[PDB]
Design an enzyme around this catalytic site. Structure first.
Site, mmCIF file in Angstrom:
data_model
loop_
_atom_site.group_PDB
_atom_site.id
_atom_site.type_symbol
_atom_site.label_atom_id
_atom_site.label_comp_id
_atom_site.label_asym_id
_atom_site.label_seq_id
_atom_site.Cartn_x
_atom_site.Cartn_y
_atom_site.Cartn_z
ATOM 1 N N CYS A 1 -0.373 9.532 3.054
ATOM 2 C CA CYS A 1 -0.926 9.280 2.467
ATOM 3 C C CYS A 1 -1.446 10.262 1.309
ATOM 4 C CB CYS A 1 -0.217 7.628 2.438
ATOM 5 S SG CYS A 1 -1.994 7.629 3.076
ATOM 6 N N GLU B 1 0.707 -1.262 -0.006
ATOM 7 C CA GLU B 1 -0.062 -0.177 0.125
ATOM 8 C C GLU B 1 0.808 0.639 0.181
ATOM 9 O OE1 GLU B 1 -3.447 -0.726 -0.247
ATOM 10 O OE2 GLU B 1 -2.510 -1.710 -0.771
#
Ligand SMILES: Cc1cc2nc3c(=O)[nH]c(=O)nc-3n(C[C@H](O)[C@H](O)[C@H](O)COP(=O)(O)OP(=O)(O)OC[C@H]3O[C@@H](n4cnc5c(N)ncnc54)[C@H](O)[C@@H]3O)c2cc1C
Ligand SMILES: NC(=O)c1ccc[n+]([C@@H]2O[C@H](COP(=O)([O-])OP(=O)(O)OC[C@H]3O[C@@H](n4cnc5c(N)ncnc54)[C@H](O)[C@@H]3O)[C@@H](O)[C@H]2O)c1
Ligand SMILES: O=C(O)[C@@H]1CCCS1
Ligand SMILES: [Mg+2]
Length: 1217
Positions: free
Chosen positions: A828, A794
């Site tokens: 993120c 991820e």
């Protein structure tokens, strides 16, 4: 250096006994609040009968003069549908934006009436949600602009100029005379003469609130100052009771009006209020401070206190203050104010209201996970509170001037009789809102009625300014529970309207019970799991206790050690320094040797059977116990996260909540799914990033553990201490030391773990470039069964937000400031590219830059700090190199100035960079750097292409009111987490399952239902995971297979079509005022590497059943197996001789023996761009196992979070009373 947390959140003043009694009631359970209010509101039988009689007489008069509205009469005359009425009023609004009356009438007569209104008139329908309330009484959060356009064309072509003329005249009246008393204070004063002669008075509201910039606050200040002069000149010595006054909102006068910025509020806002009050004193008019959100109540009391004790204001009794009876603190606030009035000798004007922000208070408490609401949840409770507080005020008329603001005839009658027969002007008054309460109070004011005065709250402003206040009013008028809605309901009898709320509450079985249909924040998810709890940083008790816990956390000697199954190991030791101040040593870390990392994997493999044998329910019980321990330890965990990772208190709270939610969510998903046949992979290596150093750390490890795998936990080298504490908590919760080993160190330790022969799976969250190195390592390896080692990776984002000209600039700017600069952009999910429609870009940019300059950057152990440091000097240098390159190219760069105190740490100021094209960005810049681009409306589809063209696909935001734009953009964007009319940093576990595509991730999503299935050898069926839809190309392929005689493969294809969950479309439980959606889509183009004809047919069936296109390896030589395909299938099929030229792919299916799989895995890893989720099988496995290729990993999850309160209120809660 300043001692850690020595100045965290000191109160403005020491809290008196009376102030502490207010704070103690902030979130008191409703069953405890009501009994004392019922006692205080009790009146004698004779008074209750007299009050019911008065209320009936008022209600009969109201219903007897009730005429049809102008809009209703217009709808009737021209037989308009609801959408036609809305569309007509939107047209009239736009026509009134044309100043010259003759120019407007020419456009109507010669252009609008004659046909194409589109060719002559920013969507016409930007404010249709407001007009929808006017026409229909119902609030819709977004606008169906295609329906409204059709309705407008239809009504104009049917009815012509006469209906347009009527709409314009109606809108001009409502916007000039009903929604406001006047456009300017002079106009409003001229119009007030008629009712002042009848005995009414006025309080003027210069519409204005929630300043975003210093310039905004300055503008609202000079507006108030100019209105005070006009009102004071007009008052002409009438004084504060007979003469007019002004009302102000403190949020209008400072852009950072909050408890977190209390020092700025007292230093900068207070003198402005004092200056306005001095002018009101000189004219001897009233000046009222309006009440706003619950987290501003107690702050406002500190301003009221200083002003009432200020000798420069003595001699004047015009200072006024609102108290909200829907709030649990109301009687204690009144006790404080009455005592302040006694101490100061000022006869404070106290306006008792019910309250205007109810929907938003319910949503806020739920979002923040707080213990209870600061407002009542049953409407009748607010009514009892109001009457109880009125009794307190009526006993104190020598000390305060009560002002009873209400449109409810039952409330009014109860107070009129409570007050008794002795009256004089100045004892108390009633109040009402302009254009709402005059029908009621014309039955009250005057010697021929009840001979009690009423002050009219009179909004003043232009069409534009009237926004927020109007929707709050129209919500009020339309709510099922509102008196003014029920008086018009023919199904509601007068006996129902005059029912005594005090006696009804007393007779209920559980006095004061919470509303049955509103969930406490802890209960958002019902029986599935317990919501994590937050902390209220506006509560002085909480701030005082947190200050002590934070200081105590900073005195602890935090360490992180290689914690192997056999015990702690020795290694190289160094200190961990606060990124905001390198003089502040937070703790010490001993890092793991590569030899011990390999040893830890061997110990994990030896211990794997003993952990797999712990039943799933007991593994989940460990997770639930760990969650309880983290919840109890939250204040200490906050202090460590604040100092180790540069987080603010608010962000650390969110971080610990997320960790608790991961533990409880994976525990519940385990209880829903895992059985004896879902065997663990084996030792799993969990490698985690620094920026969410507890939450993502805990989430990966908790998932791997509860699926039955022993874990090697390798935290980021920057943030080992909080990771060590999380492992200590998991071990205390019952996770054996052999099942969870902590290996601190840098990327060398992570790589040694990935490469270890016994490593059976890798969970990585971090940068795309590191993920690619891990992908290369794993392509060398196969499991003992000869299959690829599963990797969840991820990775980064290049996240955009698109804003069109229908969005509300103030909402946009708040969500942009949060999304781009929260945590110094080290999320993120952070907003990297803001895309502004050209027509509104300059106004939004000006507002954004003004809000930027109100941010406080510094060491994060002060509540007043908004933006902390970046994690390392290397991170700072990399971010600054990007900023300077952009500055070198001549791009406009806006930067906050940094205080000298930042030099002891590593800080980058929040930065706005104005770009010319999206291609100006290359890679993710993980810092507080927002890029801004402009676009023309017709280029929107191309802009979405440009956003997708980066190859990233993590978070994405859209701000618009227009359904057509929502449908267009969300159908074309390719990102894993979408956000509509809100910020884009939401990752609430199980609500916005989080994770993206392309360069942003392999999936499955953390915090979603497919995650655990990746960590076992045979995936379970997740809860709710199915679809009744069958891909039509799959169906065509199955028919083609049957026509070719491939009967077994055709049957397998039909089975894949049924088993696929493509098309799943769910709404996930969450907070009110939001819709959280979860959907399964195709991944994209899947690379197929077959070996045999039957293998190809199986691969193609799996890919088509999940909605994908394919690129088939041309080197397979199997072209003759796919002759004469139906055109529908051929459109999805391409052949690839050069895989790198034909990507990017979204996954791969491989057939072959072990060494063929290994060779293909290396070739796939060498492809440029995104990591591919590869599934491999032998020809024999394809023959034996119908699930050889798992359809779970051939679909793509998409989460969408829609703020349905964005239009200014909550339609669902309008029916909750
Ligand atoms: C002149 C004037 C000035 C005002 N100034 C302010 C101010 O400065 N700040 C402010 O916040 N309000 C203020 N208000 C109040 C607000 O704007 C509404 O007008 C008022 O709350 C409506 O109450 P009511 O007695 O007219 O009607 P009612 O129909 O009797 O009461 C409606 C109220 O009940 C409450 N309510 C509705 N549902 C629930 C529920 N499920 N649980 C608990 N409570 C519920 C809400 O407060 C709602 O507004 C003012 C009102 C007036 C008339
Ligand atoms: N998609 C998500 O959910 C998500 C969440 C948070 C952060 N991120 C991404 O994470 C990045 C920021 O975190 P970071 O700076 O800690 O990432 P990073 O890639 O620098 O390091 C992450 C972890 O990988 C380890 N590492 C470094 N080199 C390695 C190697 N050669 N082999 C094995 N492990 C190695 C590091 O020690 C660390 O534990 C950002 O790009 C951010 O976008 C993504
Ligand atoms: O919605 C509002 O603005 C509230 C009602 C009157 C003043 S405060
Ligand atoms: Mg790194």
């Amino acid at each position: 250096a300043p001692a850690p947390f020595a100045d965290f959140a000191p109160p403005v003043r020491p809290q008196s006994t009376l102030r502490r009694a207010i704070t103690a009631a902030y979130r008191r359970p409703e069953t405890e609040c009501l009994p004392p209010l019922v006692e205080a509101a009790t009146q004698s039988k004779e008074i209750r009968d007299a009050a019911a009689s008065t209320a009936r007489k008022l209600i009969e008069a109201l219903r007897g003069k009730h005429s049809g509205s102008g809009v209703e009469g217009l709808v009737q005359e021209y037989s308009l549908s609801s959408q036609e009425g809305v569309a007509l009023m939107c047209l009239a609004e736009a026509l009134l934006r044309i100043p010259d009356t003759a120019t407007r009438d020419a456009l109507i007569r010669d252009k609008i009436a004659d046909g194409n209104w589109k060719s002559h008139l920013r969507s016409l329908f930007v404010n249709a949600a407001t007009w929808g309330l006017v026409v229909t009484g119902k609030l819709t959060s977004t606008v169906n602009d295609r329906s409204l356009a059709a309705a407008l064309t239809r009504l104009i072509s049917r009815c012509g100029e006469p209906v347009i003329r009527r709409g314009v005249d109606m809108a001009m009246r409502m916007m000039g005379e009903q929604f406001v008393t006047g456009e300017t204070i002079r106009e409003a004063l001229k119009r007030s003469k008629e009712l002042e002669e009848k005995g009414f008075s006025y309080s003027y509201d210069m519409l204005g609130e929630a300043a975003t910039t210093a310039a905004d606050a300055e503008r609202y200040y000079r507006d108030y100052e100019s209105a005070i002069h006009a009102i004071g000149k007009a008052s002409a010595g009438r004084g504060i009771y007979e003469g007019p006054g002004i009302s102000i909102k403190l949020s209008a006068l400072h852009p950072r009006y909050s408890r977190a910025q209390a020092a700025r509020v007292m230093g900068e806002l207070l003198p402005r209020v004092k200056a306005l009050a001095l002018l009101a004193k000189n004219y001897d008019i009233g000046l009222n401070i309006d009440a706003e959100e619950a987290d501003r109540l107690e702050l406002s009391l500190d301003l009221l206190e200083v002003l009432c004790l200020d000798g420069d204001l003595s001699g004047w009794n015009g200072m006024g203050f609102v108290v909200q009876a829907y709030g649990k603190r109301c009687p204690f606030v009144l006790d404080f104010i009455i005592d302040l009035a006694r101490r100061s000798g000022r006869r404070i004007m106290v306006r008792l209201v019910k309250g205007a922000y109810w929907d938003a208070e319910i949503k806020r408490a739920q979002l923040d996970g707080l213990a209870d609401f600061p407002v009542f949840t049953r409407k009748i409770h607010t009514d009892v509170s109001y009457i109880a507080c009125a009794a307190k005020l009526l006993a104190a008329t020598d000390v305060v001037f009560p002002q009873f603001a209400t449109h409810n005839a039952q409330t009014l009658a109860a107070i009129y009789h409570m007050a008794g027969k002795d009256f004089h002007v100045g004892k108390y008054e009633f109040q009402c809102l302009h254009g709402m309460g005059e029908p009621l109070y014309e039955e009250v004011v005057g010697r021929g009625k009840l001979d009690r005065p009423c002050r009219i709250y009179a909004p003043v402003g232009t069409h534009e300014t009237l926004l927020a206040y109007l929707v709050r009013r129209l919500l009020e008028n339309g709510a099922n529970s509102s008196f003014v809605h029920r008086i018009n309901d023919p199904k509601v009898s007068i006996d129902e309207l005059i029912a005594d709320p005090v006696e009804v509450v007393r007779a209920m079985p559980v006095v004061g019970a919470k509303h049955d249909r509103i969930a406490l924040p802890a209960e958002l998810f019902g029986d599935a799991r317990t919501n994590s709890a937050g902390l209220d940083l506006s509560n002085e008790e909480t701030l005082a206790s947190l200050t002590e816990a934070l200081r105590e956390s900073a005195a602890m000697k935090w360490t992180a050690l290689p914690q192997l199954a056999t015990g702690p190991a020795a290694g190289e030791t160094r200190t961990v320094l606060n990124p905001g101040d390198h003089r502040d040593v937070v703790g010490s870390v001993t890092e793991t040797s590569e030899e011990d990392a390999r040893r830890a994997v061997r110990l994990a493999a030896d211990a794997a059977p003993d952990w797999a044998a712990v039943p799933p329910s007991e593994r989940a019980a460990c997770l639930d116990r760990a969650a309880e321990l983290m919840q109890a330890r939250m204040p200490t965990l906050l202090g460590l996260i604040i100092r180790e990772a540069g987080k603010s208190a608010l962000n650390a709270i969110a971080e610990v909540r997320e960790a608790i939610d991961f533990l409880r969510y994976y525990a519940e998903q385990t209880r829903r799914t895992l059985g004896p046949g879902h065997g663990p992979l084996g030792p799993i290596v969990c490698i985690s990033p620094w920026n969410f150093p507890l939450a993502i750390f805990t989430g990966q490890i908790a998932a791997a553990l509860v699926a039955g795998n022993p874990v090697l936990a390798k935290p980021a080298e920057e943030t080992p201490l909080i990771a060590a504490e999380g492992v200590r908590i998991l071990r205390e919760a019952g996770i054996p030391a052999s099942a969870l080993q902590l290996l601190p160190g840098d990327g060398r330790v992570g790589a040694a773990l990935v490469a270890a022969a016994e490593t059976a799976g890798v969970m990585f969250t971090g940068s795309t470039e590191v993920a690619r190195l891990i992908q290369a390592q794993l392509a060398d390896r196969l499991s003992p069964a000869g299959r690829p080692i599963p990797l969840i990776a991820e990775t980064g984002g290049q996240n955009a937000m698109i804003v069109d000209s229908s969005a509300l600039a103030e909402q946009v700017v708040g969500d942009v400031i949060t999304s781009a600069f929260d945590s110094a952009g080290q999320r993120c999910s952070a907003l990297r590219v803001l895309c502004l429609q050209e027509d509104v870009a300059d106004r939004i940019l000006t507002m954004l830059k003004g809000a930027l300059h109100e941010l406080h950057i510094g060491r994060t152990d002060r509540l007043s700090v908004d933006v902390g440091p970046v994690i390392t000097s290397e991170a700072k240098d990399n971010i600054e190199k990007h900023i300077e390159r952009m500055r070198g190219l001549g791009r406009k760069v806006e930067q906050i100035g940094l205080a000298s105190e930042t030099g002891v740490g590593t800080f980058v100021p929040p930065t706005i960079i104005e770009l010319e094209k999206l291609s100006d960005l290359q890679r993710e810049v993980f810092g507080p750097v927002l890029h801004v681009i402009r676009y023309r409306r017709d280029d929107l589809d191309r802009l979405v292409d440009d956003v997708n063209a980066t190859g990233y696909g993590l978070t994405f935001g859209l701000h618009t009111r227009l359904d057509e734009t929502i449908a267009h953009v969300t159908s074309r964007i390719k990102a894993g987490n979408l956000y509509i009319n809100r910020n884009i940093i939401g990752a609430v576990v199980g609500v916005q399952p989080f994770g993206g595509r392309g360069l942003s991730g392999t999936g499955p999503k953390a915090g979603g239902p497919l995650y655990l299935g990746r960590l076992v050898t045979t995936a379970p069926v997740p809860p709710q995971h199915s679809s009744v839809h069958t891909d039509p190309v799959l169906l065509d392929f199955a028919k083609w297979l049957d026509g070719k005689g491939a009967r077994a493969e055709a049957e397998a294809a039909r089975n894949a079509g049924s088993s696929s969950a493509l098309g799943l479309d769910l709404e996930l439980p969450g907070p009110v005022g939001e819709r959280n959606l979860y959907t399964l889509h195709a991944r994209g183009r899947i690379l197929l590497v077959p070996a045999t004809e039957s293998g190809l047919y199986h691969q193609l069936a799996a890919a088509l059943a999940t909605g994908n296109s394919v690129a088939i390896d041309a080197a397979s030589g199997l072209q003759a197996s796919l002759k004469n395909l139906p055109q529908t299938v051929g459109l999805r099929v391409s052949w690839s001789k050069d895989w790198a030229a034909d990507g990017p792919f979204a996954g791969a299916l491989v057939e072959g023996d072990a060494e063929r799989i290994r060779a293909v895995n290396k070739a796939i890893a060498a492809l440029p761009g995104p990591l591919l989720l590869v599934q491999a099988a032998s020809s024999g496995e394809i023959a034996r196992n119908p699930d050889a290729y798992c359809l779970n990993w051939l679909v793509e999850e998409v989460s969408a979070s829609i703020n349905t309160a964005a239009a200014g209120g909550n339609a669902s809660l309008m029916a909750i009373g």
